[PDB]
Each structure stands twice: as structure tokens, then as C-alpha cells.
Amino acid sequence: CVVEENDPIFERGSTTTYSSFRKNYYSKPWSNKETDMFFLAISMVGTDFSMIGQLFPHRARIEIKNKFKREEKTNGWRIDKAFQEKRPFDFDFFAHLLQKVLAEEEKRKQK
């Protein structure tokens, strides 16, 4: 038996209710240094979103795809320069930069 485990809710007016149409997505915005390192990751990998999402643990692959589409629609010259420039794939230094970004967002939250 439920021993006062839940509380009654005074919701769902029998009169009527409306729609929402927006439930879950609720993305989170980027920053300047984050956009810089994102362009770096683009120049380093390409357009394959699987690897980008794997290397970005704290940002979603859908958000990454939305950002890439927004960049393709607004700033084309930047994407062109990114594809022009190339960098060999780095793993240890990339994890170090990930830790640096974690520390930076921690400092931001502190601020």
C-alpha cells in the first residue's frame, strides 16, 4: 500500500485544456571558445556527425547538426576556410582541451 508516498495534484481542470507542441528539445547555446573549438573539430574531421558526437560528450549530436546547418546557412566563408585548413587528428591533446573546457564551464557556473 502507498504509505503517503505521493501527493495529490490539483491539475487537469475538467473545463478544457490547450496544446503545447514543444516538449523536450530545449537546447543550450554555445559560446565563442566553444564555437572556435567546434570549427577546429570540423577542420580536423569533416562533416561526419558520428565522430563529432563521440568526441563531444556534453553536447548532443542533434545540437551539433543544428549548429552545422546554421553555420552552412549563415557563415559560408567560415566553413570554406575550415575545410581549406586541415589538422591531423589529436587524441591526448584533445582530451586535455576537453578537460580545459570542463574547467572553463565550471568557472562560468561559479561566476
Binding site: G13, T15, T16, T17, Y18, S19, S20, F21, K23
Partner: protein, 180 residues
């Protein structure tokens, strides 16, 4: 099918309540609605504004004095409904309901009417407070619709002579909304 049958007879019924009682989500609901209407091609009469206004005004409990709501908030039904109808007609003629959801505008109109019927005791009441008192789910864009309707009312005040001299604002034009 229920919605089309309800529309064919000029009967107001909100798709929100339909989805609530149908165990479905608005996204898939609208998708399948568009698919079926494109596949059938049946007449889809537009949702009349006055009928929905009356249906939503009948929901509010500011007509009979209940234990929770004091007598000060209780107002007349016929006069408040007429005021809400005039306000929503003004909104429809001023390009406020076109392209936007109608129910937020209806809520803003009935709130402005309830405040204008007695501006004194309700100058401090807010939209969220009114929604809590009436036991109605507060629409999100209702605030923006209210802010736009109040701007339109301020423009009407500026057009009028005595009000433009009084130099009212979005908080003091509620007492003259009736004259507008």
C-alpha cells in the same frame, strides 16, 4: 473525424482538449490531420472566434460566488462576455489573431475585460494570479498578446482627445478601455 464533425456544424471545440482526451501528442496529431485532409478533401470551416470566446468564457468561475473566489472578483456574465467579444473583434480587425493562436488572445481579452469592469481592486492582479484564481492553464503567448493589445489600446487613447491629454499608460488605460 470528431473535429471535422464538430466544425461542420459551426461548433467550437479546441484541438488541445481533443488531444488531451484522445491520448495523443500535438505533433503527430497535426501531421496525421494534414495527411488525412490532403487525402480526403472535405470542407473545413474556419473556427469562428465568437463561439470559441463564449465557450472559453463559460469556463471561468467568476459568475457565481464560490468559497475560494471572494465576491470582489465575481463579475457579471453578460457584460463581461460582451466586452470580451468586442475586444476579440478588435483584435481580429487589428491583425492580432491572424497567424497566432486564438486562445491566448481570448484569454488576454477576457482578462482585460475583467480588469476594466473594476480597475480599482484589480490594478495589482497579474495574469498568473488571474489564471490561478480561475483554475485555467496559463497560455504562454497570452502575455505577449496582452502587451500588444494594450499597445493598440494606447494608440486608440492617443487618437482620442481627452486620453491623449491624460497621457495614460499600459497600466492606467484599463479604466478607459470601455470608452475605447
Amino acid at each position: 473525424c470528431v473535429l471535422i464533425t464538430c466544425r461542420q456544424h459551426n461548433w467550437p471545440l479546441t484541438m488541445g482538449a481533443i488531444c488531451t482526451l484522445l491520448y495523443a501528442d500535438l505533433d503527430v496529431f497535426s501531421s496525421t490531420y494534414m495527411q488525412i485532409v490532403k487525402l480526403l478533401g472535405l470542407d473545413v470551416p474556419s473556427l469562428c472566434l465568437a463561439e470559441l470566446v463564449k465557450t472559453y468564457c463559460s469556463s471561468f468561475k467568476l459568475f457565481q460566488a464560490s468559497p475560494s473566489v471572494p465576491a470582489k472578483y465575481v463579475e457579471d456574465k453578460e457584460k463581461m462576455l460582451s466586452r470580451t467579444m468586442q475586444l476579440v473583434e478588435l483584435a481580429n480587425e487589428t491583425w492580432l489573431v491572424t497567424g497566432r493562436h486564438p486562445l491566448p488572445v481570448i484569454t488576454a481579452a477576457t482578462f482585460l475585460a475583467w480588469q476594466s469592469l473594476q480597475p480599482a481592486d484589480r490594478l495589482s492582479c497579474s495574469l498568473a494570479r488571474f489564471c490561478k484564481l480561475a483554475n485555467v492553464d496559463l497560455p504562454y503567448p497570452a502575455s505577449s498578446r496582452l502587451q500588444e493589445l494594450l499597445a493598440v489600446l494606447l494608440r486608440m487613447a492617443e487618437q482620442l482627445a481627452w486620453l491623449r491629454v491624460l497621457r495614460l499608460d499600459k497600466r492606467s488605460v484599463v479604466k478607459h478601455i470601455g470608452d475605447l
